[PDB]
Amino acid sequence: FKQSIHQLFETQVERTPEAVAVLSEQGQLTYEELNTKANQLAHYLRTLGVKSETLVGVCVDRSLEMVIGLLAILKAGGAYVPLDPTYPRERLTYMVQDAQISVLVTQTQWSNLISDYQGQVICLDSQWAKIASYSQENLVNTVNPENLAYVIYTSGSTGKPKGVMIEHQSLVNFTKLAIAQYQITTSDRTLQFVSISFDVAAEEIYVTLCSGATLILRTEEMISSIPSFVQKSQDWQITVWSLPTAYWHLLVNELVKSKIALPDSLRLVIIGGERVQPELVRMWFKNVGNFPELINVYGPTEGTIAVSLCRLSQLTESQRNRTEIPIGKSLGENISVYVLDETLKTVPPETPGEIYIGGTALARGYLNRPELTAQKFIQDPFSPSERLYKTGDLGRYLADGNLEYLGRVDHQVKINGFRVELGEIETVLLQHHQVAQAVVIDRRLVAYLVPHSTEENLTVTLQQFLKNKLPSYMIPATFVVL
C-alpha cells in the first residue's frame, strides 16, 4: 500500500474539507483551501522543473505560507530543504551550493539571503496573483515512496553541516505510527512550536494535518515568557503541546515557582530532544499529576524524527524515583531499536551498549557524504537486506523492557535545544589566523584556545568571526587562553 505524505494529507482533505487545517494570529485555512493553494503552487513549481528528487530550498517564516510551501513542494514531487533565515549568509549559501538547489520558495523579506543566487526564486508574499492562476487540482503520480521528502541539515564535526535525506516512506510510517500512539483526532489542536530546521516540526505538522486536527502556529513573542506561553495556549484551547525538553524544564520551574494553571484544554505534552531531569519529572508529577499525559520521545534525525517513546504519566512511583527516566520502547513493530556491543551483537538485559536503529525509520543517508554515510549507516551483518544506524547514543534495556539513555560516545551535544557538534565549532575557530589549536566543551559552551598572537579583544573578535559562519547557539559565551 504505497503512499506519500501528501497523499495521506489529501485523503484527510477529502474526508473533512471544511475543517480548519491551520490557524495563526493572522488568519486561517480550511483543509480544502490549504490543499487548493498548495496545489496551485505545486503546479507552478512543476513548470519550474521541480520533479521527483529535486531539492527545493525553503526560507519562509512561520506562517500559513510556510505550510502551503511545504505541502506544495511535496505535491510537485520535490524534497524540501529548510533554510533557516536566522543563520548567517555564508552558512545558507553553503547549503544551497551543497544541495544544488535551483528553486527557492521564500518571501520578499528574505531576498538577499543567498549570495550569488542564480536559480529560480518564488516569493509567496508578492507573487500570489500569479500562483492563483495555476490549477487547484491534486497532481497525480509525481513521486514514489522511496523518493525524498526532505533534506534537513545538521551540525557536522568535520566543519560544515550535512543534509539528512528522508524518504516519503519513512516519514509516512512515522506519521501513521505517531497519530495512533498519540491518539490524535479531528478535535485536537496542536501548537506548532519548533522551527522547520528541526525534524520535530514535521511531527507537529504532518501528525496534525494527516489526522484532521488543527495546526496552530505560534508567534516568537509567545515563548519568551512561560506565563504568556500558557495563557496564549489557553486562549487558543491547545490540546497538544510539543516541547523541546529544555523548554519543558523551564516550564516546570515556572509552573511551581508561580501558581500557574495549565490550560484546561491541554491533554498531551510531548517532550524530547535531550535527557529529561528526573527531579523535574518528580516535580511535574507532584504539582500537575497525571493529566495532561506526558510523553518522552527519543530519536535522531537520521531515524526520521523518533523511534521510541515512554509514557511518563504511566510510570510507577518507583520507576520515576530512578536516576534515569526511560526513553521507552519502539514506536512500532517495523522500527528496531537495538542496544548492541562492538561486534553488533545484542546484549543481555540491563547491559549497556550502543544504540542502533533498524527498519523503516532509517534515512536514506547523508547528502554528498559517502564516507560518513558508510560509517553511520551500516549493513546489518545478521540481516543482509537491511541497515543499522549507529546513533552514537549509549543505552540499556531494563528488565521491564524499557530503554534507558546513558549518554554519548562522542562530542555531539545539545545547546539550548539544538544539536551541536563540538568539533564543528573547534574546526571553524582553527581557520582563524590567531588560533593555533582549540577545544570547545560543554557546559554552556566554553572555548579553550592557544593563540598565535593574543590581544585583549580576542573574545569579541572570535565571536564576530563565528557570527558570520555558525548559528548563534554554536557561539561560545566564554573563551579561555594559555
Ligand SMILES: Nc1ncnc2c1ncn2[C@@H]1O[C@H](COP(=O)(O)OC(=O)[C@@H](N)Cc2ccc(O)cc2)[C@@H](O)[C@H]1O
Ligand atoms: N528523549 C531523549 N532523551 C535523551 N536524549 C535525546 C532524546 N531525544 C533525542 N535525544 C538526543 O538527541 C539526539 C538526536 O538529536 P536530533 O537529531 O536533533 O533530533 C531530536 O532530538 C528529535 N528528532 C527527537 C524528538 C522527537 C520527537 C519529539 O516530539 C521531540 C524530540 C539523540 O541522538 C540523543 O542524543
